[PDB]
Amino acid sequence: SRRARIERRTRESDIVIELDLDGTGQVAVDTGVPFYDHMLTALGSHASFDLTVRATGDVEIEAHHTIEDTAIALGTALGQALGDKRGIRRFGDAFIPMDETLAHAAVDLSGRPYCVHTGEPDHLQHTTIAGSSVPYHTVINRHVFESLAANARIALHVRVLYGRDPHHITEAQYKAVARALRQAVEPDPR
Amino acid sequence: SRRARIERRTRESDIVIELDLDGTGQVAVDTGVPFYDHMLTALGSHASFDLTVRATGDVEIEAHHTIEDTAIALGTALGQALGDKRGIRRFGDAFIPMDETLAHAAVDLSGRPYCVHTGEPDHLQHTTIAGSSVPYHTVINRHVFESLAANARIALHVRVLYGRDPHHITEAQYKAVARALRQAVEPDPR
Amino acid sequence: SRRARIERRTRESDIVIELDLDGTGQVAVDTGVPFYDHMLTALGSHASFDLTVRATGDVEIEAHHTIEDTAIALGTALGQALGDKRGIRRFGDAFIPMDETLAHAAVDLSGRPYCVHTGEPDHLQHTTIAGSSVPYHTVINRHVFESLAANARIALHVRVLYGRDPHHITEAQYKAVARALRQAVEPDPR
Amino acid sequence: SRRARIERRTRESDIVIELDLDGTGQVAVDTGVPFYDHMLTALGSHASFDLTVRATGDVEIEAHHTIEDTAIALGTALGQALGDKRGIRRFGDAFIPMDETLAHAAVDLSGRPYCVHTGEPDHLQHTTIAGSSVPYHTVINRHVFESLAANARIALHVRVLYGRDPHHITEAQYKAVARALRQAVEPDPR
Amino acid sequence: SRRARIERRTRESDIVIELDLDGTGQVAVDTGVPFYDHMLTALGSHASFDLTVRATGDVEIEAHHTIEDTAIALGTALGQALGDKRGIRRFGDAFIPMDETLAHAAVDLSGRPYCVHTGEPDHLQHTTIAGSSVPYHTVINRHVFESLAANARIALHVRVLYGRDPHHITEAQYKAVARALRQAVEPDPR
Amino acid sequence: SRRARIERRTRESDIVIELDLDGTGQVAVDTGVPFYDHMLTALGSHASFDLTVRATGDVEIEAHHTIEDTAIALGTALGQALGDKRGIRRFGDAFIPMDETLAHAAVDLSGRPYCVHTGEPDHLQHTTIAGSSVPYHTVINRHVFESLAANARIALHVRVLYGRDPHHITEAQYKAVARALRQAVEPDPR
Ligand SMILES: NCCSc1ncn[nH]1
Ligand SMILES: NCCSc1ncn[nH]1
Ligand SMILES: NCCSc1ncn[nH]1
Ligand SMILES: NCCSc1ncn[nH]1
Ligand SMILES: NCCSc1ncn[nH]1
Ligand SMILES: NCCSc1ncn[nH]1
Ligand SMILES: [Cl-]
Ligand SMILES: [Cl-]
Ligand SMILES: [Cl-]
Ligand SMILES: [Cl-]
Ligand SMILES: [Cl-]
Ligand SMILES: [Cl-]
Ligand SMILES: [Cl-]
Ligand SMILES: [Cl-]
Ligand SMILES: [Mn+2]
Ligand SMILES: [Mn+2]
Ligand SMILES: [Mn+2]
Ligand SMILES: [Mn+2]
Ligand SMILES: [Mn+2]
Ligand SMILES: [Mn+2]
Ligand SMILES: [Mn+2]
Ligand SMILES: [Mn+2]
Ligand SMILES: [Mn+2]
Ligand SMILES: [Mn+2]
Ligand SMILES: [Mn+2]
Ligand SMILES: [Mn+2]
């Protein structure tokens, strides 16, 4: 009913997305960027989407092309699956407490791309989240939200009210976007 | 069930309001102030009210007396139609993204008039929205929210978190108020 | 189903709490601190809890030990009654207008204690609310929210956006927490 | 070869665009907003496009819906007519002196919507250009550039280095965008 | 006609460059520093050079010696291939929009080495671009432009007007230099 | 075709100008002010004009009357030789790197005299360039650009982005103006 399959093959990367808006949080994400997988898994889950994301890309350069291409493909999928947008809440918002962090997100499935990203502390624009694999530069948080909004053709406002930990700040943001989308895509009983 | 018809005849103007709180967004507004009609139409619509507004007034002087008298009559109608306020959510709030603008509104159908209007950029206190008809001075936004709160006997808090375009800032505010009212007037299942 | 009875006997005080999360606002509070009773009654009521609170303590010293011990016992009760936390909204938030005051609260029933208390004007850290009985020092607002979060094992973020009256600022906060809890403990249909 | 016809009918307005990128400046614009017609005529002309723009809309409210809808339809047309974007310069830029004003524009026909609008003096965010017809609020300059970039799927950077007259500042900007587009859409001999 | 082959063997590294100024963007770069390869590939491509770069070096220490030695060898090649500099445009410049970033570059193939690097945000002087291989410290951007200018014996001015993402800021700069070189090396018809 | 001969005899000086816009840089300048000759030679050359300038004047007072009268006569010549201005690019601009200096110039052969001169460091308004002959006060740079624009009836914007050496700052400016004129006077193929 509200499903979309997107394939996006560039010189930089290969993306397959399968998205059902009316899911139960059945989510599997594999981008080669494990922190990004964790964020996109928290997004799909907290949005009660069924989401499959399979991505390979030029992670020898860094995560950027794969992160952006995935966010672009995911946006296209959200847009396609929404279709005519008949009888939906359309507007949604969500606060996400995560220990010391508070994030907020607000959406208008308007058909008019716009992203406003505010309140993220300045140290996130050169912070790295690094494990045993390909690292995640938090400077990309904004890039992900803008790419998502641009390609889904929605108004997305993402706010950090406050926070310290870059992992908490990033996850709370992805989760805020997720629960804001969840409210907005729900059928409107009126 | 939750309907009210208000007639308000002053030396300055003539207002007829018909309001059903349990509507499907069937809205018709004619004040002689076309931007005001657009705002009151977005309010009635986004609140899922059925709303009729018919107003004539001294627009040769300017929109002010007609805008205020309409907002006063509309408040009286909201108050009357709410009646005893038994079993309603009572509290409501809504974020409205509109491109670069973010507006918020929060209501307590408390029975105690109060309006707090914050965050509206200072250029709105001398900005004009002008077409081929009677213009709308955005300095009146506040006046409209105060008149509404005063005559509905509710607590209304309207916030501009940020924004640039005076049309976006004004509409987002009217829409925020609308969706906050919509949540608050809904039957409370508990 | 989601009920808990907590008894907490210290050298300082004696607390009995009976809490049903799936209540209809049937609330009775008696701490010997009448303003505190009013706040805990507004919390239980606005959360649609059924809540009984019976507390006696060393109010000859002042309200502090009784207020804290009650908040601790209440948290333990909220935590116990929540149990496994299966199928709940988990996240909740609420704006509370109260005349000139606007308060906000956001919860994650995460299982990870955290409290962030922001925006409360500085005069509240030495303000007294005094009647014909034991007075309430508003400096304790924070202490109550921290004790609640610590013992329920939840993330609680409480914000005063603005306000002047210490009674309005305090009640709006307790009410915000209540409606945020109410949303978060509701069954999640997905 | 590089032509597109766009029809955009909303509740607010009706737009017909016919655009040839390989034109000789044969341009006719009729929006009901005469200053906007002058700007879109200078854009089509200075870009050496052949451009027809026919628009009717709710100018009784003000120019905004008609201006935005036209800019949206024009962007869609630019995007469609560009097609595969094979063998074009792709990047373009232009300085426009206009008496005391200096404007600049830079484009990447990247396929990735982005607009950056900088240097416009603050008085333009509440300035009106008014004649015998429907007026033009210069606050809309930005809205036009963003809508254009969003719907053509291009990177558009528009800069006011300096200027005083709102007519000079606005026209120089439209002309800068035009000559930047003209360079970028030219066949690349390599 | 305008070709050069440079071999540069130091204790630190081994470089082979083959450069044709009159190319069609046939570019292959392998330095062991994959982000650097991406930047030098965007430079060769956007300059319509045919460029081969093969480099091995002490990347166990870090990318610096290999990045610098390559930039030095590339400069020597640009200088040699330019020869007498008869009948060329000599001056070139280019703006590069890249999402939020705007970069500019201006060249005088003067025969007089000079580099001015301005506007790069301060976080780039300790930012890392890290993938699955050898990382790239953006502090080296300047070093690359200076080495290039020093060894090609040209005036190179590289400017960041604004930008946030370190990947966008760096690539836009390399691309600006490329398109500025492309204009300047073109035959001058006069 | 695009040639002009101007004679200007005042009490202060005698000027003969012969100007061909479609030249090959065949330039001869003799004003009695050798630095001025060098600047006007770089202007004629870099503009691909054929230019003859012969001037005698009251250099016992200082260079000013001769410099201004020459700039006036040169402007008259540029204006006359341009004639109807049919089928020309009309707009032109050029960046000039000169070691540490960056200058820019932008022209609109609009028929409407205007000069904006910005960014020149303050020490140039009392700096002297002195050899074995009549010296050149750099305070006259502005006077030359204004006289040129006034008498050619063009919009001339001259900018120093930065620089230190007064010889580099002055020459880069004259060269910027020259290459901006060269682009603008070229036949427009469309
Ligand atoms: N995928 C290539 C165009 S977008 C980009 N962002 C960073 N580098 N390239
Ligand atoms: N272990 C999951 C809940 S706590 C957390 N901190 C960072 N991410 N998640
Ligand atoms: N009388 C109850 C509503 S108004 C109020 N002010 C302080 N507490 N309540
Ligand atoms: N065309 C309606 C959606 S966009 C808008 N801008 C101003 N009002 N509405
Ligand atoms: N008359 C056209 C050239 S001058 C101008 N000022 C404002 N617009 N155009
Ligand atoms: N020798 C000519 C190129 S370098 C220079 N410095 C000052 N004028 N020219
Ligand atoms: Cl989680
Ligand atoms: Cl709408
Ligand atoms: Cl109450
Ligand atoms: Cl908020
Ligand atoms: Cl014109
Ligand atoms: Cl590219
Ligand atoms: Cl030279
Ligand atoms: Cl510039
Ligand atoms: Mn990118
Ligand atoms: Mn995590
Ligand atoms: Mn009034
Ligand atoms: Mn509107
Ligand atoms: Mn204590
Ligand atoms: Mn009270
Ligand atoms: Mn708009
Ligand atoms: Mn004009
Ligand atoms: Mn070095
Ligand atoms: Mn890249
Ligand atoms: Mn003079
Ligand atoms: Mn010189």
- Ligand of minimum distance to the alpha carbon of A35: 16
Same domain, yes or no: D106 and D190: yes
Distance between CA atoms of residues F99 and F115, nearest Å: 26
Cα torsion angle, D10, D15, D21, D22, sign: positive
Same domain, yes or no: F84 and F99: no
Contact B34 D142 (CB under 8 A): no
Chains touching A (3+ CB pairs < 8 Å): B, C, D, E
Nearest to B140, CA basis, from B156, B122, B124, B164? B124
User: What are φ and ψ of residue D181, in 5° steps?
Assistant: -55, -45
Nearest to E71, CA basis, from E1, E133, E148? E148
How many domains are contained in chain F? 2
Q: What is the CATH number of the domain that holds E57?
A: 3.30.230.40
Q: Which of C91, C156, C159 sits opposite A94 (nearest CB)?
A: C91
- Ligand of minimum distance to the alpha carbon of A61: 24
Establish if A142 touches chain E: CB-CB under 8 angstroms. Answer: yes
Q: Which helix (H) or strand (E) holds E46?
A: helix E34-46
- Looking at CA atoms only, how far is residue E151 from chain A in angstroms? 27
CB atoms closer than 10 angstroms to residue D63? 28
User: ∠ CA E155-E160-E163 to the nearest 5 degrees?
Assistant: 160
Nearest to F141, CA basis, from F126, F163, F154? F126
Establish if D111 touches chain A: CB-CB under 8 angstroms. Answer: no
Chain F residue nearest residue D182, CA to CA: F190
Establish if F126 touches chain D: CB-CB under 8 angstroms. Answer: no
Q: Which of B108, B112, B154 to mutate to test the pocket of ligand 3 (most atoms within 8 A of CB)?
A: B112
3-class secondary structure, E105 = strand
Residue B118 CA to ligand 13 center (angstroms) comes to 60
Establish if A114 touches chain B: CB-CB under 8 angstroms. Answer: yes
CB atoms closer than 10 angstroms to residue F32? 16
Contact B34 D58 (CB under 8 A): yes
Is any atom of ligand 4 closer than 6 Å to the C-beta of D12?
yes
- Crossing angle of helices E140-152 and E166-185, rounded to 10°: 10
Same domain, yes or no: D180 and D103: yes
F137 strand-pairing partners: F128
Contact C114 A99 (CB under 8 A): yes
- Of the residues B43, B62, B89, the one at which a domain ends: B89
Interface test with B, best of D60, D145, D151 (most B CBs within 10 A): D60
User: ∠ CA B74-B79-B85 to the nearest 5 degrees?
Assistant: 145
CA torsion D9→D12→D18→D20, rounded to 10°? Answer: -120
Establish if E166 touches chain A: CB-CB under 8 angstroms. Answer: yes
Residue A60 CA to ligand 8 center (angstroms) comes to 45
Same domain, yes or no: C84 and C94: no
Which CA distances in Å does B3 have to B23, B25, C38, F142? 10, 14, 35, 74
Nearest to F58, CA basis, from F16, F12, F14, F7? F12
First-to-final CA distance of chain D: 20
Nearest to E168, CA basis, from A139, A59, A32? A139
Distance between CA atoms of residues F172 and F175, nearest Å: 5
Same domain, yes or no: D16 and D104: no
Distance between CA atoms of residues D35 and A112, nearest Å: 25
Same domain, yes or no: B144 and B190: yes
Chains touching E (3+ CB pairs < 8 Å): A, D, F
Residue E60 annotated as lining a ligand binding site: no
Indicate the burial class of F132 (C-beta count within 10 angstroms; 0-12, 13-18, 19 or more): exposed
Residue ID of nearest Cα to ligand 3 atom 2: B110
Give the residue carrying structure tokens 């093969």: E54
User: ∠ CA E146-E148-E149 to the nearest 5 degrees?
Assistant: 65
Establish if B26 touches chain A: CB-CB under 8 angstroms. Answer: no
Same domain, yes or no: B95 and B68: no
Which CA distances in Å does D101 have to D79, D163, F93? 30, 4, 15
Q: Where are the beta strands (DSSP E) in E45-188?
A: 50-57, 91-98, 101-108, 114-118, 128-129, 136-137, 155-162
Chain B positions in Cβ-Cβ contact with residue C179 (cut-off 8 Å): 91
Residue ID of nearest Cα to ligand 6 atom 3: E110
Is any atom of ligand 3 closer than 6 Å to the C-beta of C175?
no
- Of the residues B37, B72, B89, the one at which a domain ends: B89
First-to-final CA distance of chain B: 20
Is any atom of ligand 6 closer than 6 Å to the C-beta of F159?
no
- Ligand 6 atom nearest the C-alpha of F168 is 7
Distance between CA atoms of residues A47 and A181, nearest Å: 6
User: What are φ and ψ of residue C48, in 5° steps?
Assistant: 50, 30
- Residue A32 one-letter amino acid: G
SS3 of chain C: CCEEEEEEECCCEEEEEEEECCCCCCEEEECCCHHHHHHHHHHHHHCCCEEEEEEEECCCCCCHHHHHHHHHHHHHHHHHHHCCCCCECCEEEEEEEECCEEEEEEEECCCCCEEEEECCCHHHHCCEECCCCCCEECCHHHHHHHHHHHHHCCEEEEEEEECCCHHHHHHHHHHHHHHHHHHHHCECCC
Is any atom of ligand 2 closer than 6 Å to the C-beta of A39?
no
Same domain, yes or no: F160 and F82: no
Same domain, yes or no: F71 and F108: no
- Residue B16 one-letter amino acid: V
Interface test with C, best of B116, B153, B183 (most C CBs within 10 A): B116
Residue A119 annotated as lining a ligand binding site: no
Residue F158, both tokens:
């001259």
Containing domain of residue D127, as a range?
Answer: 90-190
Same domain, yes or no: D85 and D95: no
Same domain, yes or no: F94 and F74: no
Same domain, yes or no: A111 and A28: no
Pairing assessment for the beta strands F114-118 and F155-162 based on DSSP bridges: parallel
- Of the residues E89, E115, E131, the one at which a domain ends: E89
The answer to whether the beta carbons of residues E44 and E5 sit under 8 Å apart is no
